[PDB]
């Protein structure tokens, strides 16, 4: 195939997107999930792992990892630890909201996602760290684990398997920075979301200790579906290395903001006119889109018209997929407003931990901050540069990484808006 | 918005707080959801129980949930500075939290947040006089597609208007509680216009499933 | 022996399996820059200023805390390395405050010593500093906590050595504040270890508050008598007066800790 | 009768400040047998 998207809805994996359908487990089973799970359980996990590798399922979290390759990081002999898969429901990006969406409609494919894959990975129990603000998808998510059990599907020999699983939530408290996998860990574990560094690696030393892998709601939710329909299923959409369906937030300014499943190479102009009804006043309207949430570099009206929602081609594109959230930015915005909000929004979700983050995001919001009203001067601009790449690559974490490169985007498609910003405040002040 | 405690009359060792014994039930409940040797585990969850049996914290309930789960109470400490939902300050009955970062700035979150001041009388941080509602300025809540919204204690409110948020803080001045949901036409997620996909029955069980299975 | 080789700026050296990059810098007679890495304390890894290059990795890694693989040639004085140590000293730099001359911790500071060694000459922090509010843990430790660079070191060392669990960070980001989130006081009976650690004017010594100062005082190395530990210290006097009591390590008697009697 | 122009999910209005905890307290009888690190916590 060489032109990507319009998916069809008999190809579709998250049916009951929408919250049109029942949620519960009498409607989840109606739909195709919790179908033939002990046939899949039986299998062993070196098939299950070797449908995930065949699928081409990359990290749904936004790194886009290998999933396969991430989950045969367990495939090795028990030293006495257990081993916990752990769902990384906690979704603090912004422009994401598609966890939110599996978690209160499909909360039975999460839940058959855990047992699938924690048999893949040999886990003893599924620790759902689901976002603290997501209250009423936490307790919808308990009401189909309650399902889940009273139907015998996990627990004490789920699906009639012999294999012992357990799901269990736990709720967050209100930080960004425990959707970082290794801060997440911390949180489970009781103290500071705090990120650790690597290596350890989670497989090896992950939550209490134990080998433990921390995957995406989407990327443990879709793993059912690789199981039943086939790993070259979900291999036939896509690019090569950029395989799959993918949920899009197409969020901002755009006509009718929404969530929709779509096939992963599609173009992003073709996304926004037809899921979302296009830009507020046209396309000839828009001035930039953050393709993928707001750690992603933004992109402007000429990079937008011709490119692909995939992975590779947003790196080539010198941005990233990210959460493949689209935020919509039309002519009217401020976009130094946007991003020092997008800076501020980093500031006040840091952990504090590492000295590069802890101080120079807080500097890179005065410094955005002031470039707003414009109170300054041109060979600041570089300079903020410069602040960006001494915190990217050299913090704990990427969420320097994630604060640096809305800073770099801004700075080098929006420089002379930035220079005519502050020779403006330099001519109405002086 | 501090960060080291003074003891206030009301705000100290001192000050009385213990569990319901439905609540020692519910802790006993949540601490058997991690490893034996890991209780430490237990501290967010209990200590939000603590947030939900009292509406906020004050120091007792740290050195209880503290000393229930035989920590140090510097350990409970850091956590309840850490996390922003524990609120270590008595907030209003309806907390009103509004999103105002950028998917949710760029669809106007502003007017919401000037017709939510302007309604109760109040500015960012205020409790009205009453203590009924709190209103602060939060980051990304997560439902950027229904930008904007609001939280109110459990629930979002969401694709708001100035006089949708006005009607709901009319509501809750009159003691219902309204539905959690886009004040808009559209029902979660969906395109506002109608369906540009899932319009076709879902399959059910059996479609599509490989052979050899 | 199971020792593996490894390379200190192309130079071959035998380290055992599990060796940081750090200590495999220290076999060869190089010493890392470092805040928070302490060789009696756990590894933190929070301070970022140990980043060194590995060669044919385009990433600096955290020296204090990454363990060395078979045939890494770690660059100690590579141009990203050097570039890595004074990005991380300017943001150690953005927010501390301008108190060397009125800070016990001058002539004797890590801050000091390592900004003239590993960082840039002058400042582009073209904005205003944070003033965090002072603590009082006790009347030997007096603590100016503007000064601190949140390197952790106060809160492994009550932890791990003298067994405490009452000093700890407080709140998230650039307000992240270490104390005890109480009026609490630290008194431990090694509770003036922490002005030994603390790589900056901190946490200083209150009965030598102001009094002295590093370059004129003479250091004799001399015994403690307080108790039958027999724990090795400096006496260091300033003008045939006595100033101070430091430590010695001593690996066998007290490592390089000593009381707060003997203090 | 397939119906798509109805929102099924309507559960969640009837959630209270206890629903996610009387949920966990529920299914605590249908769990395994949590492992143990053999002490009773890290300072034992
Ligand atoms: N979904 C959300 O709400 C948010 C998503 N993100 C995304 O998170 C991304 C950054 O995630 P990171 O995990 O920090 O990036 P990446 O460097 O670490 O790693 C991605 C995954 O691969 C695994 N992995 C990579 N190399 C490995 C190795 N050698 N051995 C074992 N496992 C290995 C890691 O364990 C991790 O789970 C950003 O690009 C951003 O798009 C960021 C913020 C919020
Ligand atoms: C600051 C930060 C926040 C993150 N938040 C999330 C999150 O909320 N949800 C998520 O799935 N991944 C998040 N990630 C990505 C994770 O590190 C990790 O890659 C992912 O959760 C699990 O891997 P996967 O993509 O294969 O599923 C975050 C990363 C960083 C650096
Ligand atoms: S860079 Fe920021 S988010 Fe990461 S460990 Fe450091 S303080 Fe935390
Ligand atoms: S701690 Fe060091 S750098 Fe800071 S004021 Fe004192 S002597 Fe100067
Ligand atoms: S007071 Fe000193 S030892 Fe303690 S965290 Fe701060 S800089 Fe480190
Ligand atoms: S931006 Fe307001 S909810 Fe995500
Ligand atoms: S010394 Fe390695 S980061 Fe502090
Ligand atoms: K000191």
Redesign the interface.
Known sequence: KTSFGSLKDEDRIFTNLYGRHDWRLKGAQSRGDWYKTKEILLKGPDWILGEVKTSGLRGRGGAGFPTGLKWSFMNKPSDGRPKYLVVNADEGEPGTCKDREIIRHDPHKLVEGCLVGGRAMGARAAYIYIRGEFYNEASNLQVAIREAYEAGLIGKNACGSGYDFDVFVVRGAGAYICGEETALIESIEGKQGKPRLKPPFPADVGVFGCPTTVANVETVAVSPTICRRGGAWFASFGRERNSGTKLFNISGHVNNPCTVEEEMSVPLKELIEKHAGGVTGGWDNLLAVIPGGSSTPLIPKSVCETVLMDFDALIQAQTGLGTAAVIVMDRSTDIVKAIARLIEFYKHESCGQCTPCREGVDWMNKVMARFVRGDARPAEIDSLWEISKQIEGHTICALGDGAAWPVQGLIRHFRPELEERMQRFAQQHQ | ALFVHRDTPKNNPETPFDFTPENYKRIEAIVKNYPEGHKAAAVLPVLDLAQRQNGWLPISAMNKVAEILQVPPMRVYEVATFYTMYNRKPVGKYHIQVCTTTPCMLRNSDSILEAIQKKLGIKVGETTPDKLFTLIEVECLGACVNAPMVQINDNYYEDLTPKDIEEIIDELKAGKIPKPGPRSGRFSCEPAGGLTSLTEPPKGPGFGVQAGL | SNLIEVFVDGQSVMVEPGTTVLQACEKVGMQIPRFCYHERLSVAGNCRMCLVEIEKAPKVVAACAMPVMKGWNILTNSEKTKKAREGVMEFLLANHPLDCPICDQGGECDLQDQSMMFGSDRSRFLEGKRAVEDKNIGPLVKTIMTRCIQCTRCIRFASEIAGVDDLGTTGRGNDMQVGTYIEKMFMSELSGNIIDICPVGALTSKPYAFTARPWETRKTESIDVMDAVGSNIVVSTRTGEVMRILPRMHEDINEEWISDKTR | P????????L???D?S????????????K???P?????????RH
């Open positions: 397939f119906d798509n122009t109805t929102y099924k999910n559960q969640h209005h959630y400040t206890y629903t996610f905890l009387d949920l966990n307290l529920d299914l605590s249908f769990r395994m949590q492992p143990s690190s053999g002490r009773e916590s890290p």
